[PDB]
Design a binder for these strands. Sequence first.
RNA 1: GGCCGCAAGGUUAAAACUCAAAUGAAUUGACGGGGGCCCGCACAAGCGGUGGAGCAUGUGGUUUAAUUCGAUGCAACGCGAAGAACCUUACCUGGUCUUGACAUCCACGGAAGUUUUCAGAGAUGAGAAUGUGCCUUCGGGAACCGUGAGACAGGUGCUGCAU
RNA 2: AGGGCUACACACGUGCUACAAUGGCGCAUACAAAGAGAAGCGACCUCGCGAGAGCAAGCGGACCUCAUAAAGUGCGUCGUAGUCCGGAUUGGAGUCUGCAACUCGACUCCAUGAAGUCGGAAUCGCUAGUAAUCGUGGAUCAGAAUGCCACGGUGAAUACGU
RNA 3: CUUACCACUUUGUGAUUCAUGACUGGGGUGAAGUCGUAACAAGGUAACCGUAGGGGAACCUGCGGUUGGAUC
RNA 4: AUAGACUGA
RNA 5: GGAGCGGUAGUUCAGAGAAUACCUGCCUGUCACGCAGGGGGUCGCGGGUUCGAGUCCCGUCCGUUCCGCCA
Length: 61
Amino acid sequence: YDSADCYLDIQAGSGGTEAQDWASMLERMYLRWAESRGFKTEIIEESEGEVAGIKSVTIKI
RNA sequence: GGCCGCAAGGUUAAAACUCAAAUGAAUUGACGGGGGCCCGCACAAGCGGUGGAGCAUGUGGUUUAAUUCGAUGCAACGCGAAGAACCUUACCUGGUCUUGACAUCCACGGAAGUUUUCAGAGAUGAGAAUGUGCCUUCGGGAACCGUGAGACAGGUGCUGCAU
RNA sequence: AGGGCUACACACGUGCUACAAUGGCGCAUACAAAGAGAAGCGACCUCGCGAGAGCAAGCGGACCUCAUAAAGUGCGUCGUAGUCCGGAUUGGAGUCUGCAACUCGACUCCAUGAAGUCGGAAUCGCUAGUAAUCGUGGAUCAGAAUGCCACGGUGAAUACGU
RNA sequence: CUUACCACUUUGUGAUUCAUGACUGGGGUGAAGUCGUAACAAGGUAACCGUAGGGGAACCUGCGGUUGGAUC
RNA sequence: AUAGACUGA
RNA sequence: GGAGCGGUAGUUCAGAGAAUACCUGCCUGUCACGCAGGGGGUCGCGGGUUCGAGUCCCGUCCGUUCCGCCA
Ligand SMILES: [Mg+2]
Ligand SMILES: [Mg+2]
Ligand SMILES: [Mg+2]
Ligand SMILES: [Mg+2]
Ligand SMILES: [Mg+2]
Ligand SMILES: [Mg+2]
Ligand SMILES: [Mg+2]
Ligand SMILES: [Mg+2]
Ligand SMILES: [Mg+2]
Ligand SMILES: [Mg+2]
Ligand SMILES: [Mg+2]
Ligand SMILES: [Mg+2]
Ligand SMILES: [Mg+2]
Ligand SMILES: [Mg+2]
Ligand SMILES: [Mg+2]
Ligand SMILES: [Mg+2]
Ligand SMILES: [Mg+2]
Ligand SMILES: [Mg+2]
Ligand SMILES: [Mg+2]
Ligand SMILES: [Mg+2]
Ligand SMILES: [Mg+2]
Ligand SMILES: [Mg+2]
């Protein structure tokens, strides 16, 4: 699968809302890194956090 | 498990495991959709605005080689900035330098300086002339430019949760 | 050295100008305060429709310059229309600083003439020379204010009360 | 030789105790999850006790009792 | 008359 | 296998609309709730009639039903 398209799943953990914000900060830099490499970005699913951030994101790169 | 009861259940009554506390009275604050008494353009009475339009300016976001850094409820957002074409500039691209742009200090060479060409976007580099002066134990040098050290310079680099 | 901080599918904050008749425009005519000026303030005269240009006094200033204040008053006109409102945007031609206004300054002249007809939820300031409104000056600064700081002109309404 | 006593051993049925057993009831710990906000102020329907019923859940309601309830 | 909730150094 | 019903906003339902949902701006110290302004599907898929089709007709996937028996 070295040349296969990758699918990234980011789920928040310990930290609650702050963890969700950290997850949102984590996915943003992954998307920007993929854009810099030229890879296509596709938001498969994102379950927005209750207060801030997103609990879980699945993005196809 | 035993006894009692139609039943609901009552009475007697543990163990494993887990924690370093649980708890009572009182004290100082803080808070209450508790009480009482007051103050402020805080409401109430008025006047004029913003939110709709265009433009100026700042910020978040996006973009970008860079879109420099900081300020984020009131108490950030015409804020640091009482003023970015160059400079400022701390950012990016490219061309360059490496005791250095900026300081002390050692030794050596030179006055310092003032003008002309020269190739480069410029930094810089190659020259060419001009003067080569002043205090002066006339013995010195003093200043100001270069060379070679190497102790050092340098940072708008991080932490305002060390100050 | 050049470029960027001025980038632009958007959102927010603070302001300026308007949506006009308590007004636009043309003519005439009164009343202020405060402040700065020597690599600076710049008179008078001449030229340019204009921004400004040439020449050249005065002043280190209660002396000279910046420097006609506007709102106001009189007359005329416009006559309720996106208009003789509004001046965004754009084309052309210029002036000034500065080595150099392409990115990216200010201003002038001709031309064009956008939205905007009083703004939803919501929200702000003000108790007297205050609010509202009108001009003037200064710091920064070679050039670059609708921002900041200060100066005066007209000048209200309302407060039963907690 | 025989009788009596009697150990080993055999049968049936109970008791007690240990280990284990598909499944199942509650209990204790969570540096983060979902649903509410029941208690602490008069906690926003005063709280609690016994009892009965009801409800995802903390809990709600009826009857009696207490102050270990504020304002008045 | 209505009015809920603030994880973890 | 036979006889009917359907298939439409992300979902559930009407015939291109409603509720929920989703943005944006408010309120709030922040979220929720609440207020205000918006957008969102071209009718499961194909053909044919029709000047004209989500609609009418046929075929096809797709789910829903009832029946499929007597020796
Ligand atoms: Mg028992
Ligand atoms: Mg009021
Ligand atoms: Mg506006
Ligand atoms: Mg910034
Ligand atoms: Mg810093
Ligand atoms: Mg620059
Ligand atoms: Mg430079
Ligand atoms: Mg501190
Ligand atoms: Mg800037
Ligand atoms: Mg500009
Ligand atoms: Mg003076
Ligand atoms: Mg006009
Ligand atoms: Mg219009
Ligand atoms: Mg007062
Ligand atoms: Mg000035
Ligand atoms: Mg200036
Ligand atoms: Mg005034
Ligand atoms: Mg409660
Ligand atoms: Mg209660
Ligand atoms: Mg009940
Ligand atoms: Mg009694
Ligand atoms: Mg909750």
